């Protein structure tokens, strides 16, 4: 049963989630398409940082643990936001309430098919679950608070926080889906697929190094091997 504390917490998370971008257009058009995608990714990282700062317990962790959690959850949270913006009809993703892109647009933007296909496959599977604002906000909080991320010091506290979001999701889903007890584990199981997507993205980052395609400062910081 959803308690008043969990209800209030979920509502605050939903409210917390409620521009000079290089236009989308030769070697130059490919460079500008690549630049467009890197700039959308930067806007996404900035929104993730803003949201994480509003998560109960996040700012009480050391700044070092905050960075450790954000560095490796950023891509998972970005791919959840991508899945939330999926259009099943046209099999495309709408970024910033305008920019609609399909599998071919992602290829044109410098992405390898080995990464594009799993993103669209994940987005399709996620869209079937039909998650609302509260369930996406709680899954995002659960993804951020993973004690198993590399370089996390207070693993016990990160894990205690994750359990508060997991419990809130369980209690919430029991009201949203009172006749389907499988909806709560089905949502949790999507975090399993995000780990693989994160592993596939790392291979994509390594491929960009090989083709000497440089990422902008913030993306290079969180993703490149230094």
């Amino acid at each position: 049963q959803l308690s008043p504390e969990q209800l209030g917490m979920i509502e605050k998370l939903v409210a917390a989630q409620q521009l000079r971008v290089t236009p989308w257009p030769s070697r130059e058009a490919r460079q500008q398409r690549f630049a467009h995608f890197t700039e959308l990714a930067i806007v996404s990282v900035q929104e993730i940082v803003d949201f994480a700062k509003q998560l109960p317990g996040f700012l009480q962790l050391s700044r070092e643990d905050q960075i450790a959690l954000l560095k490796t959850s950023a891509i998972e949270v970005m791919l959840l936001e991508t899945s939330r913006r999926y259009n099943p009809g046209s099999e495309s993703i709408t970024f910033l309430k305008d920019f609609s892109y399909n599998r071919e647009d992602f290829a044109k933007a410098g992405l390898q098919v080995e990464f594009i296909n799993p993103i669209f496959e994940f987005s399709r599977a996620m869209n079937e679950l039909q998650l609302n604002d509260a369930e996406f906000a709680l899954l995002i909080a659960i993804s951020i608070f993973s004690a198993d991320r590399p370089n996390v010091q207070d693993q016990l506290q990160v894990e205690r926080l994750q359990h508060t979001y997991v419990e809130a999701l369980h209690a919430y889903v029991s009201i949203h889906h009172p006749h389907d007890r499988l909806m709560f584990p089905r949502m949790l199981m999507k975090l399993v697929s995000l780990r693989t997507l994160s592993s596939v993205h790392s291979e994509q980052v390594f491929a960009l190094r090989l083709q000497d395609k440089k990422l902008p400062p913030l993306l290079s910081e969180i993703w490149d091997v230094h």
Binding site: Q46, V49, K53, R63, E64, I67, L70, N151, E221, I222
Partner: peptide
């Protein structure tokens, strides 16, 4: 530290 190696993320968190 991770902090000294993530100056932009550090600055985004501080603001």
């Amino acid at each position: 530290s991770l902090t000294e190696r993530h100056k932009i993320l550090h600055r985004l968190l501080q603001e």
